[PDB]
Coordinates of all heavy atoms in Angstrom, one line a residue:
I1 N 65.9 12.0 31.6 CA 65.5 10.7 31.2 C 64.1 10.6 30.6 O 63.8 9.8 29.7 CB 65.5 9.7 32.5 CG1 66.9 9.7 33.1 CG2 65.1 8.3 32.1 CD1 66.8 9.8 34.6
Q2 N 63.2 11.6 31.0 CA 61.9 11.6 30.5 C 61.9 12.0 29.0 O 61.1 11.6 28.2 CB 61.1 12.7 31.3 CG 60.1 12.0 32.2 CD 59.2 13.0 32.9 OE1 58.0 13.1 32.7 NE2 59.8 13.8 33.8
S3 N 62.9 12.8 28.6 CA 63.0 13.3 27.2 C 64.0 12.4 26.5 O 63.9 12.2 25.3 CB 63.5 14.7 27.2 OG 62.5 15.6 26.7
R4 N 65.0 11.8 27.2 CA 66.0 10.9 26.6 C 65.4 9.6 26.3 O 65.8 8.9 25.3 CB 67.2 10.8 27.5 CG 68.1 12.0 27.4 CD 69.2 11.8 26.4 NE 69.3 12.9 25.4 CZ 70.0 12.9 24.3 NH1 70.7 11.8 24.0 NH2 70.0 14.0 23.5
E5 N 64.5 9.1 27.2 CA 63.8 7.8 27.0 C 62.6 7.9 26.1 O 61.7 8.7 26.4 CB 63.5 7.2 28.4 CG 62.8 5.9 28.3 CD 63.4 4.8 29.1 OE1 64.5 4.3 28.7 OE2 62.9 4.5 30.3
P6 N 62.6 7.1 25.1 CA 61.5 7.1 24.1 C 60.2 6.5 24.7 O 59.1 7.0 24.5 CB 62.0 6.2 23.0 CG 63.0 5.4 23.6 CD 63.6 6.2 24.7
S7 N 60.4 5.4 25.4 CA 59.3 4.7 26.1 C 58.6 5.5 27.1 O 57.4 5.4 27.4 CB 59.8 3.4 26.7 OG 58.7 2.6 27.3
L8 N 59.4 6.5 27.7 CA 58.8 7.4 28.7 C 57.7 8.2 28.1 O 57.2 8.0 27.0 CB 59.9 8.2 29.3 CG 60.3 8.1 30.7 CD1 59.0 8.3 31.6 CD2 60.8 6.7 31.0
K9 N 57.3 9.3 28.8 CA 56.3 10.2 28.4 C 54.9 9.5 28.4 O 54.1 9.8 27.6 CB 56.6 10.7 27.0 CG 55.9 12.0 26.7 CD 56.8 12.9 25.8 CE 56.9 12.4 24.4 NZ 58.0 13.1 23.6
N10 N 54.7 8.6 29.4 CA 53.5 7.9 29.5 C 52.3 8.9 29.9 O 52.6 10.1 30.2 CB 53.6 6.8 30.6 CG 53.6 5.4 29.9 OD1 52.5 4.9 29.5 ND2 54.7 4.8 29.8
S11 N 51.1 8.3 30.0 CA 50.0 9.1 30.4 C 50.1 9.8 31.7 O 49.5 10.8 32.1 CB 48.7 8.3 30.3 OG 48.7 7.3 31.3
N12 N 51.0 9.2 32.5 CA 51.3 9.6 33.9 C 52.7 10.3 34.0 O 53.6 9.6 34.3 CB 51.1 8.5 34.9 CG 51.2 9.0 36.3 OD1 50.2 9.0 37.0 ND2 52.4 9.3 36.8
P13 N 52.7 11.6 33.7 CA 54.0 12.3 33.7 C 54.5 12.5 35.1 O 55.6 13.0 35.3 CB 53.6 13.7 33.1 CG 52.2 13.8 33.3 CD 51.6 12.4 33.3
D14 N 53.7 12.2 36.1 CA 54.0 12.3 37.5 C 54.8 11.1 38.0 O 55.0 10.9 39.2 CB 52.8 12.5 38.4 CG 51.7 13.2 37.6 OD1 51.0 12.5 36.8 OD2 51.5 14.4 37.7
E15 N 55.2 10.2 37.1 CA 55.9 9.0 37.4 C 56.9 8.7 36.3 O 56.7 8.9 35.2 CB 54.9 7.8 37.6 CG 55.6 6.6 38.3 CD 55.2 5.3 37.6 OE1 55.1 5.3 36.4 OE2 54.9 4.3 38.3
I16 N 58.1 8.1 36.8 CA 59.1 7.8 35.8 C 59.8 6.4 36.3 O 60.0 6.2 37.5 CB 60.2 8.9 35.7 CG1 60.6 9.1 34.3 CG2 61.4 8.5 36.5 CD1 62.0 9.6 34.1
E17 N 60.2 5.6 35.3 CA 60.8 4.3 35.6 C 62.2 4.3 35.0 O 62.4 4.1 33.8 CB 60.0 3.2 35.0 CG 60.6 1.8 35.3 CD 60.6 1.0 34.0 OE1 59.6 0.8 33.4 OE2 61.7 0.5 33.7
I18 N 63.2 4.6 35.8 CA 64.6 4.5 35.4 C 65.3 3.2 35.6 O 65.5 2.8 36.8 CB 65.4 5.6 36.1 CG1 64.6 6.9 36.3 CG2 66.7 6.0 35.3 CD1 65.3 8.0 37.0
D19 N 65.5 2.5 34.6 CA 66.2 1.2 34.7 C 67.5 1.1 33.9 O 67.5 0.9 32.7 CB 65.2 0.1 34.2 CG 65.7 -1.3 34.5 OD1 66.8 -1.5 35.0 OD2 64.9 -2.3 34.4
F20 N 68.6 1.3 34.6 CA 69.9 1.3 34.0 C 70.1 -0.1 33.3 O 71.0 -0.1 32.4 CB 71.0 1.5 35.0 CG 71.0 2.9 35.6 CD1 71.9 3.2 36.7 CD2 70.1 3.8 35.2 CE1 71.9 4.5 37.2 CE2 70.1 5.1 35.7 CZ 71.0 5.4 36.8
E21 N 69.4 -1.1 33.6 CA 69.5 -2.4 33.0 C 69.2 -2.3 31.5 O 69.8 -3.1 30.7 CB 68.6 -3.4 33.7 CG 68.8 -4.8 33.2 CD 69.9 -5.5 33.9 OE1 71.1 -5.4 33.5 OE2 69.7 -6.1 35.0
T22 N 68.3 -1.4 31.1 CA 67.9 -1.2 29.7 C 68.3 0.2 29.2 O 68.5 0.4 28.0 CB 66.4 -1.4 29.5 OG1 66.0 -1.1 28.2 CG2 65.6 -0.6 30.5
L23 N 68.4 1.1 30.2 CA 68.7 2.5 29.8 C 70.1 2.5 29.0 O 70.9 1.6 29.1 CB 68.8 3.4 31.1 CG 67.9 4.5 31.2 CD1 66.7 4.2 32.1 CD2 68.6 5.8 31.7
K24 N 70.3 3.6 28.3 CA 71.5 3.8 27.5 C 72.5 4.5 28.3 O 72.3 5.1 29.3 CB 71.2 4.6 26.2 CG 71.1 3.7 25.0 CD 71.4 4.5 23.7 CE 71.5 3.6 22.5 NZ 72.2 4.3 21.4
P25 N 73.8 4.4 27.8 CA 74.9 5.0 28.5 C 74.9 6.6 28.4 O 75.4 7.3 29.3 CB 76.1 4.5 27.8 CG 75.6 4.1 26.4 CD 74.2 3.7 26.6
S26 N 74.3 7.1 27.3 CA 74.2 8.5 27.1 C 73.4 9.2 28.2 O 73.9 10.1 28.8 CB 73.6 8.8 25.7 OG 72.9 10.0 25.8
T27 N 72.2 8.6 28.4 CA 71.3 9.2 29.5 C 71.9 9.0 30.9 O 71.9 10.0 31.7 CB 69.9 8.5 29.4 OG1 69.4 8.6 28.1 CG2 69.0 9.1 30.5
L28 N 72.4 7.8 31.1 CA 73.1 7.6 32.4 C 74.1 8.6 32.8 O 74.0 9.3 33.8 CB 73.7 6.2 32.4 CG 73.0 5.0 33.1 CD1 71.5 5.0 32.6 CD2 73.7 3.7 32.9
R29 N 75.1 8.8 31.9 CA 76.1 9.8 32.2 C 75.5 11.2 32.2 O 76.0 12.1 32.9 CB 77.2 9.7 31.1 CG 78.5 10.3 31.5 CD 79.7 9.8 30.6 NE 81.0 9.9 31.3 CZ 82.1 9.9 30.6 NH1 82.1 9.8 29.3 NH2 83.3 9.9 31.3
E30 N 74.5 11.4 31.3 CA 73.9 12.7 31.3 C 73.5 13.2 32.6 O 73.7 14.4 33.0 CB 72.6 12.7 30.4 CG 72.7 13.5 29.1 CD 72.9 15.0 29.4 OE1 72.0 15.5 30.2 OE2 73.8 15.6 28.9
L31 N 72.9 12.4 33.5 CA 72.5 12.7 34.8 C 73.7 13.0 35.7 O 73.7 13.8 36.6 CB 71.6 11.6 35.4 CG 70.5 11.0 34.5 CD1 70.0 9.7 35.0 CD2 69.4 12.0 34.3
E32 N 74.7 12.2 35.5 CA 76.0 12.3 36.3 C 76.6 13.7 36.1 O 77.2 14.2 37.0 CB 76.9 11.2 35.9 CG 78.1 11.1 36.9 CD 79.2 12.1 36.6 OE1 79.2 12.7 35.4 OE2 80.1 12.4 37.4
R33 N 76.5 14.2 34.8 CA 77.0 15.5 34.5 C 76.3 16.6 35.2 O 76.8 17.7 35.5 CB 77.1 15.7 33.0 CG 78.5 15.7 32.4 CD 78.5 15.1 31.0 NE 77.7 15.9 30.0 CZ 78.2 17.0 29.5 NH1 79.4 17.5 29.8 NH2 77.5 17.7 28.7
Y34 N 75.0 16.4 35.3 CA 74.1 17.4 36.0 C 74.1 17.3 37.5 O 74.1 18.3 38.2 CB 72.6 17.2 35.5 CG 72.3 18.0 34.2 CD1 73.0 17.8 33.0 CD2 71.3 19.0 34.3 CE1 72.7 18.6 31.9 CE2 71.0 19.8 33.1 CZ 71.7 19.5 32.0 OH 71.4 20.3 30.8

């Protein structure tokens, strides 16, 4: 999600905000496959 999400990669790489409400279907399933 850190690489799949454009908004991500903030100054604080030690934190991530995963919101399926806005997230895409590609990334969502991507995690399900892993």
Side-chain angles (χ1 to χ4, degrees):
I1 302 138
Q2 256 184 110
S3 249
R4 281 269 128 191
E5 178 126 281
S7 184
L8 244 302
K9 203 143 74 192
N10 250 284
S11 66
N12 187 106
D14 332 80
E15 193 223 42
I16 225 208
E17 181 229 306
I18 322 179
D19 193 346
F20 292 177
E21 189 83 270
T22 172
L23 241 100
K24 258 204 170 199
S26 150
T27 305
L28 257 50
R29 204 163 202 199
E30 243 299 307
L31 316 163
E32 191 279 344
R33 249 147 66 78
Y34 269 62

